[PDB]
Design an enzyme around this catalytic site. Structure first.
Site, PDB file in Angstrom:
ATOM      1  N   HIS A  61       2.868 -16.981  -4.239  1.00 23.41           N
ATOM      2  CA  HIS A  61       4.153 -16.335  -4.048  1.00 23.41           C
ATOM      3  C   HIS A  61       4.232 -15.848  -2.616  1.00 23.41           C
ATOM      4  CE1 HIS A  61       2.093 -12.638  -5.444  1.00 23.41           C
ATOM      5  NE2 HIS A  61       3.015 -11.921  -4.839  1.00 23.41           N
ATOM      6  N   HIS A  68       4.438 -12.880  -1.037  1.00 22.84           N
ATOM      7  CA  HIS A  68       3.917 -11.629  -0.510  1.00 22.84           C
ATOM      8  C   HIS A  68       2.673 -11.853   0.363  1.00 22.84           C
ATOM      9  CE1 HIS A  68       5.991  -9.280  -4.006  1.00 22.84           C
ATOM     10  NE2 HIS A  68       6.826  -9.363  -2.971  1.00 22.84           N
ATOM     11  N   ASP A  75      -0.391 -10.798   0.339  1.00 23.25           N
ATOM     12  CA  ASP A  75      -1.699 -11.096  -0.270  1.00 23.25           C
ATOM     13  C   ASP A  75      -1.845 -12.584  -0.616  1.00 23.25           C
ATOM     14  OD1 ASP A  75       0.189 -10.523  -2.365  1.00 23.25           O
ATOM     15  OD2 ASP A  75      -1.340  -9.496  -3.629  1.00 23.25           O
ATOM     16  N   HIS A 126       5.977 -11.158 -11.838  1.00 19.50           N
ATOM     17  CA  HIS A 126       5.698 -10.282 -10.695  1.00 19.50           C
ATOM     18  C   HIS A 126       6.697 -10.519  -9.557  1.00 19.50           C
ATOM     19  CE1 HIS A 126       3.544  -8.383  -7.396  1.00 19.50           C
ATOM     20  NE2 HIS A 126       3.634  -9.537  -6.708  1.00 19.50           N
ATOM     21  N   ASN A 186       2.909  -3.356  -7.675  1.00 17.93           N
ATOM     22  CA  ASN A 186       4.176  -3.362  -6.982  1.00 17.93           C
ATOM     23  C   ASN A 186       5.208  -4.167  -7.762  1.00 17.93           C
ATOM     24  OD1 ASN A 186       6.304  -3.392  -5.086  1.00 17.93           O
ATOM     25  ND2 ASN A 186       5.450  -5.233  -4.146  1.00 17.93           N
TER      26      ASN A 186
HETATM   27  N1  LIG Z   1       1.744  -8.906  -4.084  1.00 18.71           N
HETATM   28  S1  LIG Z   1       2.319  -7.461  -3.530  1.00 18.71           S
HETATM   29  O1  LIG Z   1       2.772  -7.546  -2.221  1.00 18.71           O
HETATM   30  O2  LIG Z   1       3.247  -6.998  -4.563  1.00 18.71           O
HETATM   31  C1  LIG Z   1       1.085  -6.205  -3.479  1.00 18.71           C
HETATM   32  C2  LIG Z   1       0.868  -5.553  -2.202  1.00 18.71           C
HETATM   33  C3  LIG Z   1       0.029  -4.452  -2.152  1.00 18.71           C
HETATM   34  C4  LIG Z   1      -0.557  -3.967  -3.259  1.00 18.71           C
HETATM   35  C5  LIG Z   1      -0.384  -4.571  -4.512  1.00 18.71           C
HETATM   36  C6  LIG Z   1      -1.050  -4.006  -5.683  1.00 18.71           C
HETATM   37  C7  LIG Z   1      -1.958  -4.695  -6.438  1.00 18.71           C
HETATM   38  C8  LIG Z   1      -2.544  -4.085  -7.565  1.00 18.71           C
HETATM   39  C9  LIG Z   1      -2.223  -2.770  -7.937  1.00 18.71           C
HETATM   40  C10 LIG Z   1      -2.808  -2.129  -9.140  1.00 18.71           C
HETATM   41  C11 LIG Z   1      -2.568  -2.922 -10.456  1.00 18.71           C
HETATM   42  C12 LIG Z   1      -3.175  -2.211 -11.661  1.00 18.71           C
HETATM   43  N2  LIG Z   1      -4.621  -1.944 -11.415  1.00 18.71           N
HETATM   44  C13 LIG Z   1      -4.894  -1.178 -10.120  1.00 18.71           C
HETATM   45  C14 LIG Z   1      -4.250  -1.827  -8.877  1.00 18.71           C
HETATM   46  C15 LIG Z   1      -1.317  -2.114  -7.175  1.00 18.71           C
HETATM   47  C16 LIG Z   1      -0.704  -2.718  -6.059  1.00 18.71           C
HETATM   48  C17 LIG Z   1       0.455  -5.714  -4.621  1.00 18.71           C
HETATM   49  C18 LIG Z   1       0.629  -6.304  -5.968  1.00 18.71           C
HETATM   50  N3  LIG Z   1       0.156  -7.531  -6.344  1.00 18.71           N
HETATM   51  N4  LIG Z   1       0.441  -7.544  -7.687  1.00 18.71           N
HETATM   52  N5  LIG Z   1       1.019  -6.428  -8.010  1.00 18.71           N
HETATM   53  N6  LIG Z   1       1.167  -5.623  -7.015  1.00 18.71           N
HETATM   54 ZN   LIG Z   2       3.178  -9.902  -4.847  1.00 16.20          ZN
HETATM   55 ZN   LIG Z   3      -0.768  -9.047  -5.479  1.00 16.12          ZN
END
Ligand SMILES: NS(=O)(=O)c1cccc(-c2ccc(C3CCNCC3)cc2)c1-c1nnn[nH]1
Ligand SMILES: [Zn+2]
Ligand SMILES: [Zn+2]
Length: 230
Positions: A83, A85, A87, A148, A179
């Site tokens: 995707h 983002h 990461d 997501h 997120n």
């Molecule tokens: N892919 S993203 O940009 O939305 C992202 C950026 C920074 C942090 C995160 C991020 C990743 C994991 C977590 C949590 C999920 C539940 N367990 C602890 C970490 C929080 C933010 C994320 C993300 N990826 N998937 N969901 N959010």
């Molecule tokens: Zn993401």
């Molecule tokens: Zn992520």
């Protein structure tokens, strides 16, 4: 033995063997003042490697290529970002400078461009409708529908029964949905059900962040998302 967030300094990358010719890559990155681990995938493609997702940043992705050179010693020739983002695409410029051909769906490319993120070079057609699947080297790419993000892809390695869910799939210990700014919380359970239906033989499920497990990560993810919704 899977490496955890406190075990990987930001800037270092670990590889973990999942199955014959299948590894995950694990990196850590700082975002909004918190550190997170992040996974991607590496799949052997004869005498070459297919990479799924960057290691979340330029320096991490350079370290990923160095770790692959040391541990595996086969060239990464192609990469797919699951995707838009950072990461998943952060580090695409490093891959491209290193001669890796970078790919993503048109949905991901448009979103990355609008966001100001790095943009994979090549477009992956045939993935615009939920339930679509295409072959790409040793994997199958599957678009499960919005979860997501609206563009999120999952990746199946048929020779190993390994499902890499990316950020559409959470680890078992997850108590929060991460997120959700670009998520579709209402469609996410339906998209998870589509994955469950399409890949009933998956033996290993790898989340975007955290520990791999089995098929239970899918239902757990739907449950996490429902708890967030209310
Ligand atoms: N892919 S993203 O940009 O939305 C992202 C950026 C920074 C942090 C995160 C991020 C990743 C994991 C977590 C949590 C999920 C539940 N367990 C602890 C970490 C929080 C933010 C994320 C993300 N990826 N998937 N969901 N959010
Ligand atoms: Zn993401
Ligand atoms: Zn992520």
């Amino acid at each position: 033995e899977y490496p955890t967030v406190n075990e990987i300094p930001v800037g270092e990358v670990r590889l973990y063997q999942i199955a014959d010719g299948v590894w995950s890559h694990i990196a850590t990155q700082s975002f909004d003042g918190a550190v997170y681990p992040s996974n991607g995938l590496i799949v052997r493609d004869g005498d070459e490697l297919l990479l799924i997702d960057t290691a979340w940043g330029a320096k991490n992705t350079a370290a990923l290529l160095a770790e692959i050179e040391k541990q595996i010693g086969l060239p990464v020739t192609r990469a797919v970002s699951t995707h838009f983002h950072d990461d998943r695409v952060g580090g695409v410029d490093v891959l491209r400078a290193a001669g890796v051909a970078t790919y993503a769906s048109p949905s991901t490319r448009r979103l990355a461009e609008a966001e100001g993120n790095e943009i994979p070079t090549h477009s992956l057609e045939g993935l615009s409708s939920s339930g679509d699947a295409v072959r790409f080297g040793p994997v199958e790419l599957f678009y499960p529908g919005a979860a997501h993000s609206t563009d999120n892809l999952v990746v199946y390695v048929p020779s190993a029964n390994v499902l890499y869910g990316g950020c559409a799939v959470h680890e078992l210990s997850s108590t929060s949905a991460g997120n959700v700014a670009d998520a579709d919380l209402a469609e996410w359970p339906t998209s998870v059900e589509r994955i469950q239906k399409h890949y009933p033989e998956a033996e290993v499920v790898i989340p975007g962040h955290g520990l791999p497990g089995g098929l239970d990560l899918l239902q757990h993810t739907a449950n996490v998302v429902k708890a967030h919704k209310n």
